[PDB]
Design an enzyme around this catalytic site. Structure first.
Site, PDB file in Angstrom:
ATOM      1  N   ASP C  13      53.834 -42.333  14.674  1.00  0.00           N
ATOM      2  CA  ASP C  13      52.730 -41.815  13.862  1.00  0.00           C
ATOM      3  C   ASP C  13      53.117 -40.717  12.866  1.00  0.00           C
ATOM      4  O   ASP C  13      52.579 -39.606  12.915  1.00  0.00           O
ATOM      5  CB  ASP C  13      51.621 -41.305  14.784  1.00  0.00           C
ATOM      6  CG  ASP C  13      51.285 -42.288  15.890  1.00  0.00           C
ATOM      7  OD1 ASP C  13      50.991 -43.461  15.582  1.00  0.00           O
ATOM      8  OD2 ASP C  13      51.318 -41.886  17.071  1.00  0.00           O
ATOM      9  N   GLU C 185      42.134 -47.640  12.762  1.00  0.00           N
ATOM     10  CA  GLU C 185      42.404 -46.264  13.147  1.00  0.00           C
ATOM     11  C   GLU C 185      43.268 -45.568  12.096  1.00  0.00           C
ATOM     12  O   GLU C 185      43.336 -46.010  10.950  1.00  0.00           O
ATOM     13  CB  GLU C 185      43.097 -46.240  14.515  1.00  0.00           C
ATOM     14  CG  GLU C 185      44.406 -47.027  14.568  1.00  0.00           C
ATOM     15  CD  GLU C 185      44.971 -47.169  15.973  1.00  0.00           C
ATOM     16  OE1 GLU C 185      44.526 -46.440  16.884  1.00  0.00           O
ATOM     17  OE2 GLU C 185      45.867 -48.017  16.167  1.00  0.00           O
TER      18      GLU C 185
END
EC number: 3.2.1.37
Lengths: 532, 532, 532
Positions: C13, C185
């Site tokens: 991420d 997301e």
């Protein structure tokens, strides 16, 4: 012109062949008897079920066979004035092994009495007979490797078949090992022009399914794969109407045109999941579609893209439509069971039922339950649409709780739903709903449906509406009562059931069981099937 | 005097009966063929295997039967100058149903040619024929209830059997529903004195197993249970040598003495757990033991306590010993397979093997793998001790990796170990070890054992040492080599294998498989079995 | 010029942000402490680990946190002369809920002392702070829906953040619901030109992973998706070097060039399966890669294709290389634990260990076992290559079997392997290998390795060789002994471990446990890590 799927419902592994100006497609039947369905056509657009070669136990003995065992991918060819059918009988569908045996049966006519089986080999499934231009014949099949440190699909083997000696001669040898798609199977050889084209299926029969092709000047190879391989696959495209595109067969029409028959799955998405992760469920199982081919640099290509299209240009041959192979309402007036009806594993004998004892009725003598892989008095037909209505009327007078008969939507011994007339000690005749969800049993009706003693026929109906289906019943054929339970159609699909074998499809039919030993008869007045 | 178990190894559900001054015990054989093992004795101390009634396919067809299916608890009786054998063929051993069919076969002699089966009923297993003192005959059996909201064991049913009409007459009815031990089965009726004693088995065939008895002036009942019921059970005593004590049968000797035959399990405790939580594993499966009875207030009691003892007082009849039913080293000089040898589900035919083609050898033609429930070329014998040595020598020349033959320790299609001579493409002939642990396959030998080309016979041996067993091999009958892997005997026990069917036991034998289709023969020079 | 992955090993991420002419990438750390890894760069080619903002318990308290819980995707931004870090603390990673809390910490410098956390919200993970051109700030995050009849990913919500009041103001609202890829997301907003570009991740972090982008004139939307969406994904291409391409962040260099940082997985294929069915295993977890962007019709596109490339054109900025952040052989001469070393959930305190008590040694006081989610005396570093060699030397004198210390290759509490010096009652000091395979424990060494009493240091080494790794040991730093067990690297990958949390990667380090209560110290002389 050609609207796919050409063969709707459970009709996988299409083996297309030409006999003069007639076209035939043999498909796998697995545990359903009689074995191998053969469809006929004149224009490749309009088709109709015409035969089931394996009608005798001496040819096909599947009593006790595991679900999705028995008859796998067949191979239908025409040569020397007769049809050649290569079929397999798979005894083991799980584990390191896949015990199976390949056989050969012939017949001058497609619907005549086929010969007794000739033992070929057992090294693997997907056996195919190739008739070379020099008069020589060869048997192709995938090699199953049970060894732990190796992939089960050990490649494609070939061995010459002696028509005179009725056996394979010489020694077998691997001629192709596939691509990175792996799971190389469904070998089919074609001698076109100056090359030998080896067609195979790769990636498994699920969504990674594909059809690859390679060529070689000599039959032994090595084979060079197509520059834009696979020639058929929709794995990368979840939005395509046709999925699981693979296990194909090539045919050259008498009009010198090329087409590619192949299995396909049309999934529904009832869970609202990500299609990329959960590709869908196919209650209709694997169906048959036909793509058009075009040649370029001595390589065949699928017209419209490798994904496969719904609408395909038909060959330049006059249209020939056939009458329906089954009546909307079967009144059982014929002494012969409709060709669209099949039994599980074993042939339909006087032991299981009769169309003569009770004129204009299908009498079924109660036998083993729906979970038995041996003897079931169950006559069913395929779900060939996700929008239909099936109905039947049964006269049944059970005396004990081990006797039940009714309407049954079924996939395998571990997955089915049944609305049957049975006997309760306190309530007498009742209509019960039993569910088997991947071997998880349940009888959800808390308030049992009691049947009045004066009721002669109990009308049973089922309405399939895409992702869900509902049961209905009636005592007088006017007033219908709905069983308030929205059953899921996905539970009767290849993608839902557990096990190594998931190669059939949903069926709907009439059934009767008597686990008491009395073989109590159940009379079905008719069987209606109407697609929307 | 009587040392239990009387019948060691896989020999469950004993049905003892007297014929003059001769005593016989029929035991269940499940998937093993020929079905039903019958042992004989004169003094109840010394026994010997004498016959397998079900030798024909017309009597017993178990091809495709699930593991632990087929022949369940049998009932052997003597009346009207002949033996009566009630047996069952269970097709389904899992799920809500337990599809099975009960049959009756007779014979004037214990080892003669038994008659063709007479269909009785299918309402449940554990069928038993009772010959009343008035000349009437009755069939007893447990009622299997498949319905979700009820126990599967629906009680004991009885129905009069017409010897003349060869069928059950009238209507069946429940005469007993059991006690809090539940799982009521194994019904056996005895008319002794002024009462009818109904003997049953309860608590399941595992460690909660027990034998209960009830009496009634009339055959219909209701039956009053024994005041100190169960009359037999060791559930409360994990330390007792005999466990799972139940499924008994009563016999009155010609010397007016009473005995109780029953199945039992002698577990090992290799895991070092608490015996109260983990009761143990029985590689020898369920064996047969005999307890002595004594009467008090018209109620039978087990001498020495209900737990069951190892040493039991023998009846007052002269000792009669029998010669060994099998040689320590079977040189295969007889054209008949030793009675201690059995095959899986189907009969031993010329198709599977031969004792005449290769004199003084057991030739086995390669067929399906060890995971197949259909056709296996596997000849095996029971493990009748936890301290023995089995050995064989095989001449095998495999040409492909799909051909293997050797020594195999087996329980079911999902649980076994095999040391076989096979073919490797790079190394040629090799000796490989394959393991199937509850369907989890492995081939643990990293360094493959290469077999020299000049080696004619490959000697294979296995040493069972209680909780562990080891494989050995040799190329010249002098120098043995140990395969450094301590295999666990618990993995071939009733208590370890998964599934609804866990009713057999460990076997050891010669096997040959050819999944290539060539049916390659494997010659076994001999088979040695010696208990320590 | 740019060789991907830029951040090797467990570094998922990526949140890239520019501060003048400096570039930073914040990555998730989950249960590893200190929280959030921040890497720095000048040219986007060369990177180096520089900080871990969450160093205090008041900022991050993860004692008891489930595996793969804690710090999920972070958001690093620069505005108003300081850095803004948005992070999450996930408490529940399985079931209908995903209990988590989002916080905000700031600092003028990247490696300075960050502020105490400011509570934001808990409606979902992947929170991100957007600094609009008008001076307004907004918090973005995915909405987690626990309700049964709806998807867990309920869309992207936005809510204005008041910098002055240090809290979210007004009311949150859904501005985007994603595409058919679902699992929407990782929301990130960018105001470029005349549009607001909402970047998101879809399809899950596995192989269906992708990065989608949409635009809108207004911040509330509705947003129109990219015409050739997703802009980044390799799902359709199993052969691509970079897999699981998603969860990206956009950055505009000071040279007016555009780049796209994103996580990726480089799987191995050790099982020989079909890559289409079994995509592979990533022992290095999810790494960070950087793609170059190009604009066309006001839409960003990935240079070289959406799949993602290994070699990417670097920006037009001078090269700036950094010195290694860790020595090949760490002699523990510094009082500071190397930045590449991390502990599980809790900070490294005097309670757990010391670098001062035993100069030039890393002393670890024995605490809880490797299966504990609370207090482990385990100091480890990431596996940043599939071809390396890790080594350490430990002086340990255990007095009981509850004390062990050694080299450990770990993923989570249920998946790890450990070579530790321990105590045996009969043998004294021994070197034992313990394995935890998805909570299946085993100590496979039959012959225990005895350690002589005079041995001061026990040298432990591990060699990672792609799909397999091996342990080695020595008592004199000259003669090594190989533990003959080929451990599989796939068992320490995201794709192998069970559970809802599979977001870390393989680690290797020094450990000591004392479940006896004595907190026995273990002195590690050094720790070597050398990639091939």
């Amino acid at each position: 012109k050609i609207t796919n799927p050409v063969l709707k419902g459970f009709n996988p592994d299409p083996s297309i062949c030409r006999a003069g100006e007639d076209y035939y497609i043999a498909v796998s039947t697995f545990e359903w008897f009689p074995g191998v369905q053969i469809h006929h056509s004149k224009d490749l657009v309009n088709w109709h079920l015409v035969a089931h070669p394996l009608q005798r136990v001496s040819q096909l003995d599947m009593k006790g066979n595991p679900n999705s065992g028995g008859v796998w991918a067949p191979c239908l060819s025409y040569s020397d004035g007769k049809f050649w059918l290569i079929y397999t009988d798979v005894k083991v569908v799980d584990g390191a092994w896949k015990d199976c045996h390949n056989y050969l049966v012939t017949c001058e006519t497609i619907n005549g009495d086929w010969s007794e089986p000739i033992k070929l080999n057992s090294s693997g499934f997907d056996a195919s007979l190739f008739h070379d231009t020099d008069g020589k014949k060869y048997l192709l099949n995938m090699l199953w490797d049970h060894r732990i440190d190796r992939h089960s699909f050990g490649g494609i083997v070939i061995q010459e078949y002696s028509d005179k000696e009725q056996k394979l001669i010489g020694k077998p040898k691997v001629i192709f090992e596939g691509t990175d798609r792996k799971l190389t199977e469904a070998p089919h050889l074609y001698h076109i022009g100056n090359y030998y084209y080896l067609l195979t299926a790769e990636g498994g029969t699920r969504y990674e399914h594909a059809a690859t092709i390679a060529r070689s000047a000599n039959i032994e190879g090595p084979y060079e794969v197509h520059p834009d391989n696979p020639i058929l696959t929709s794995w990368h495209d979840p939005g395509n109407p046709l999925q699981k595109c693979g296990h194909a067969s090539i045919v050259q029409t008498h009009t010198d045109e090329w087409y590619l028959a192949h299995l396909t799955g049309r999934p529904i998405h009832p869970d609202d999941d990500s299609i990329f992760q959960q590709r869908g469920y196919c209650p209709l199982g694997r169906e048959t579609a036909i793509q058009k081919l075009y040649w370029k640099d001595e390589w065949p290509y699928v017209v419209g893209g490798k994904e496969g299209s719904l609408e395909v240009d038909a060959p330049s041959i006059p249209e020939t439509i056939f009458e329906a192979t089954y009546p909307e309402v079967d009144e059982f007036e014929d002494s012969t069971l409709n060709i669209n009806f099949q039994t599980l594993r074993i042939p339909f004998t006087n032991e299981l039922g009769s169309l003569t004892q009770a004129p204009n009725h299908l009498r079924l003598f109660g036998h083993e339950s729906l979970t038995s892989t041996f003897t079931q008095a169950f006559v069913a037909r395929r779900w060939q649409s996700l929008h239909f209505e099936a109905e039947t009327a049964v006269e049944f007078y059970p005396e004990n709780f081990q006797q039940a008969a009714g309407l049954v939507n079924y996939y395998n011994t571990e997955n089915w739903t049944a609305l049957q007339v049975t006997h309760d000690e306190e309530l007498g005749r009742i209509l019960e709903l039993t569910i088997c969800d991947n071997f998880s049993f349940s009888q959800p009706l808390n308030n049992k449906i009691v049947i009045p003693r004066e009721v002669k026929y109990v009308y049973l109906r089922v309405n399939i509406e895409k992702d869900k289906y509902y049961y209905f019943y009636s005592f007088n054929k006017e007033d219908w009562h709905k069983i308030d339970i929205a059953l899921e159609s996905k539970k009767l699909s290849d993608d839902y059931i557990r096990g190594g074998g998931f190669f059939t499809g949903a069926f709907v039919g009439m059934q009767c069981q008597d686990t008491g030993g009395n073989h109590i008869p159940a009379d079905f007045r008719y069987f209606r099937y109407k697609e929307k």
